[PDB]
Amino acid sequence: IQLFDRILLFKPPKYHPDPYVKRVKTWRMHL
């Protein structure tokens, strides 16, 4: 379930977001 770029831990009960902290995840992916 990570088809965000190529198209457009726990589970959150308040929202149904098809990940809270990406501010520094994608940046480290290019390293």
Side-chain angles (χ1 to χ4, degrees):
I1 56 152
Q2 236 75 7
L3 315 147
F4 232 67
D5 204 297
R6 57 121 76 118
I7 303 295
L8 190 50
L9 285 145
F10 280 69
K11 228 126 66 229
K14 183 122 170 181
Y15 283 85
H16 43 25
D18 278 88
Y20 179 24
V21 288
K22 282 192 104 260
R23 35 248 246 68
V24 285
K25 240 113 210 309
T26 327
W27 214 109
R28 229 135 55 195
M29 270 184 155
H30 260 206
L31 318 184

